[PDB]
A and B are shown apart, each in its own frame.
With several copies, the nearest count.
Chain A
Amino acid sequence: RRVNALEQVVIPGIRAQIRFIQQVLEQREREDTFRLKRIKGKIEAREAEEE
């Protein structure tokens, strides 16, 4: 009973939480990349238009 419970309820649940956390972290990474691209664009615009 304990083996079945661990193999069916516990481990898949922990795996699902791991997947969810990974997805959230990857989302935050993508947003940070977007922000960095915008910052670089602004820097280039200022430098190339009015120094």
Chain B
Amino acid sequence: DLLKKEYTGITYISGPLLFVENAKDLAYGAIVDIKDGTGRVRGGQVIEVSEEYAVIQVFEETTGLDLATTSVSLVEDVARLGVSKEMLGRRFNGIGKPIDGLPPITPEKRLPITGLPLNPVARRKPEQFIQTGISTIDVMNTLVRGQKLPIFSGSGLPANEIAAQIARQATVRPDLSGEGEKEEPFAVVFAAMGITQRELSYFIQEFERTGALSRSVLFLNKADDPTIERILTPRMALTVAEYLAFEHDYHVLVILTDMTNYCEALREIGAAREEIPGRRGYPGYMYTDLATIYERAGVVEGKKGSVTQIPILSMPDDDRTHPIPDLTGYITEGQIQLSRELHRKGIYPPIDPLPSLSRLMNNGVGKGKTREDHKQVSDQLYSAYANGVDIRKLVAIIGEDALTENDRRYLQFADAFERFFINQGQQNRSIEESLQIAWALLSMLPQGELKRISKDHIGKYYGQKLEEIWG
């Protein structure tokens, strides 16, 4: 460990890969240091080792490397990250090195960045409702503490704004659930892969304005940073998040800026290695790799902390069936999908409820958690909005004047829903306010049409007017 062994005899450099021929000592997955003739040192990882040579993926660019003066030295057999409680308020690059000018962290522990799978016996049911302040999330796609709830975005859609708003407004409601009345804020771990300066500056200014920097750990890999190092950024971020949550009882919110950029680096490595691909050239093991990333959230029996993940990914050409959003949806516990059509109409946040989903919603809503009518109201809203969308489709064929009164009522319900429930701007709505708006919208429909809602709830809440909330 204290001794340093060097390997010359590099025989091949191409793209992100480097071959060294007399390195049977190097372990699989080991982290190495690549030093050229100028003395500059770059990092790498062993991805294949044999008696005759080893394959190393280079984290930085390979400019200036040569086969005569470059040497490879072993750093550690297993990729580990020094973690500490002092990491809060610090900023790091994609490989965990400080970039704020402060001295390096003194590690309390060194943890393997790949982590270990949580034992399902040791897992706990994610149950604590989180009030994000956004009605389309709180009412219809409820987020609970410990969930993996990504945001499916497009090229021009304000996903970063929505994530910042959620981080700013998210809170539990102990008064509703009867839990311990505490006001402990979320610790935020922010992992950026291939982020542009425009988005990074917005995130930094939002966190500074909210005062969340002192409770945040930032791992920033910029769009001009090396691409291959993006493989490590989510892993280091999630290692820090798990350490905080399950050793110091923090409630950690993890934001991953663009999983699309992570998948691009994964595809680059896979293509360089001639892996058998899935669809559209992505490696077959993309599902397993994304699973090893996403599955690191949740809650643990006996422990008080939690890890909540909100990954963000831009769907290419707004295609939900693209491999990246497809596999993410297959792994995560629902998704929040943005609509370009809603965005073009000035609606913010442009969350489309129909393709959105929350798998853990049923665990955190109902009597004794938010309110007794929550699930039925959500179901009724979904059915009524889908009916309105279908009637919109019918209108394009037969014209609005030919509609019956039921179809016209559903069309007006869909319009008012989009304009008042989805469109909320930057305001922070409590769950009670959101349910009041939902019931006001549902009151537009005849009382007999509400098949999803029990009659006692209808008697309790039906009849209130939308003008009473405003105007």
Chain A's closest residue to B279 (CB) is: A29
Q: Is the CB of B279 within 8 A of A33?
A: no
The answer, yes or no, to whether A19 is at the interface (CB within 8 Å) is no
For chain B residues 263-287, which have a beta carbon within 8 Å of chain A? 274, 276-277, 279-281
For chain A residues 1-51, which have a beta carbon within 8 Å of chain B? 29, 31-33, 35-40, 42-43
Q: How far is the CB of B173 from chain A (nearest CB, A)?
A: 46
User: In the complex, what distance in Å separates the CA atom of A14 from the CA atom of B276?
Assistant: 33
Specify which of A29, A35, A37, A43 is in contact with B280 (CB 8 Å cutoff).
Answer: A29
Q: How far is the CB of B317 from chain A (nearest CB, A)?
A: 12
Q: Is the interface of A mostly helix, strand, loop or mixed?
A: helix
User: In the complex, what distance in Å separates the CA atom of A38 from the CA atom of B279?
Assistant: 18
Q: How far is the CB of A51 from chain B (nearest CB, A)?
A: 9
Q: List residues of chain A with CB within 8 A of the CB of B274.
A: 38-40, 42-43
Specify which of A35, A42, A43 is in contact with B277 (CB 8 Å cutoff).
Answer: A35
Q: List residues of chain B with CB within 8 A of the CB of A35.
A: 277
Specify which of A31, A36, A42, A43 is in contact with B276 (CB 8 Å cutoff).
Answer: A36
Q: How far is the CB of A28 from chain B (nearest CB, A)?
A: 8
Chain B's closest residue to A29 (CB) is: B280
Q: How far is the CB of A24 from chain B (nearest CB, A)?
A: 11
Chain A's closest residue to B397 (CB) is: A2
Chain B's closest residue to A42 (CB) is: B274
Q: Is the CB of B279 within 8 A of A37?
A: no
Q: Is the CB of A33 within 8 A of B276?
A: yes
User: In the complex, what distance in Å separates the CA atom of A29 from the CA atom of B274?
Assistant: 17
Q: List residues of chain B with CB within 8 A of the CB of A40.
A: 274, 276
User: In the complex, what distance in Å separates the CA atom of A39 from the CA atom of B200?
Assistant: 40
Q: List residues of chain B with CB within 8 A of the CB of A31.
A: 281
User: In the complex, what distance in Å separates the CA atom of A35 from the CA atom of B279?
Assistant: 13
User: In the complex, what distance in Å separates the CA atom of A29 from the CA atom of B278?
Assistant: 9
Q: List residues of chain B with CB within 8 A of the CB of A29.
A: 279-281
User: In the complex, what distance in Å separates the CA atom of A36 from the CA atom of B278?
Assistant: 11
Q: How far is the CB of B358 from chain A (nearest CB, A)?
A: 30
Q: How far is the CB of A6 from chain B (nearest CB, A)?
A: 11
User: In the complex, what distance in Å separates the CA atom of A32 from the CA atom of B279?
Assistant: 10
Chain A's closest residue to B278 (CB) is: A33
User: In the complex, what distance in Å separates the CA atom of A5 from the CA atom of B277?
Assistant: 43
User: In the complex, what distance in Å separates the CA atom of A38 from the CA atom of B276?
Assistant: 11
Q: How far is the CB of B461 from chain A (nearest CB, A)?
A: 41
Chain A's closest residue to B271 (CB) is: A36
User: In the complex, what distance in Å separates the CA atom of A35 from the CA atom of B284?
Assistant: 14
**A36, A37, A38: most-surrounded residue (chain B CB, <10 A):** A36
Q: How far is the CB of B454 from chain A (nearest CB, A)?
A: 38
User: In the complex, what distance in Å separates the CA atom of A33 from the CA atom of B280?
Assistant: 10
Chain B's closest residue to A36 (CB) is: B276
Chain B's closest residue to A32 (CB) is: B281
Q: How far is the CB of A29 from chain B (nearest CB, A)?
A: 7
Q: List residues of chain A with CB within 8 A of the CB of B280.
A: 29
The 6 closest A-B pairs by CB, nearest first: A36-B276, A40-B274, A37-B276, A33-B276, A40-B276, A29-B280
Q: A-side interface residues toward B, CB under 8 Å?
A: 29, 31-33, 35-40, 42-43
Question: Could you list some 8 contacts between A and B, CB below 8 A?
Answer: A29-B280, A29-B281, A33-B276, A35-B277, A36-B277, A37-B276, A38-B274, A40-B276
14 further interface pairs, Cβ-Cβ under 8 Å (given A37-B276, A40-B276) = A29-B279, A29-B280, A29-B281, A31-B281, A32-B281, A33-B276, A33-B277, A35-B277, A36-B276, A36-B277, A38-B274, A40-B274, A42-B274, A43-B274
